């Protein structure tokens, strides 16, 4: 009753979650200096990290 079973689906979600927080820090970093209309939600979010 105290041993819980995870399995692939949940596990991928957890790693992916970590991927999203480490992108979050970056995202804030860009919104720090931001110009209004030049950038869009691409120039910020990277791929490789996730």
């Amino acid at each position: 009753g105290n041993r819980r079973i995870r399995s692939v689906g949940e596990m991928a979600e957890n790693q992916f979650r970590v991927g999203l927080v480490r992108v979050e820090r970056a995202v804030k970093e860009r919104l720090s200096l931001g110009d209004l209309d030049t950038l869009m939600p691409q120039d910020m979010i990277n791929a490789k990290p996730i």
Partner: protein, 50 residues
């Protein structure tokens, strides 16, 4: 969806640019038989008990 609040709001948006589906990562896919192929090699993910 990128929202920008008029500076010193009551919250209302100056501009919202919807960047169509920025690409982040390629996540592996699970096979019809429940296996994964990471690099040319079938790999299975064992369920966890914690």
């Amino acid at each position: 969806r990128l929202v920008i609040y008029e500076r010193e709001a009551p919250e209302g948006t100056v501009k919202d640019i919807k960047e169509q589906e920025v690409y982040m990562g390629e996540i592996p896919l699970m096979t019809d038989n429940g296996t994964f192929v990471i690099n040319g090699t079938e790999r299975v993910i064992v369920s966890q008990l914690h």
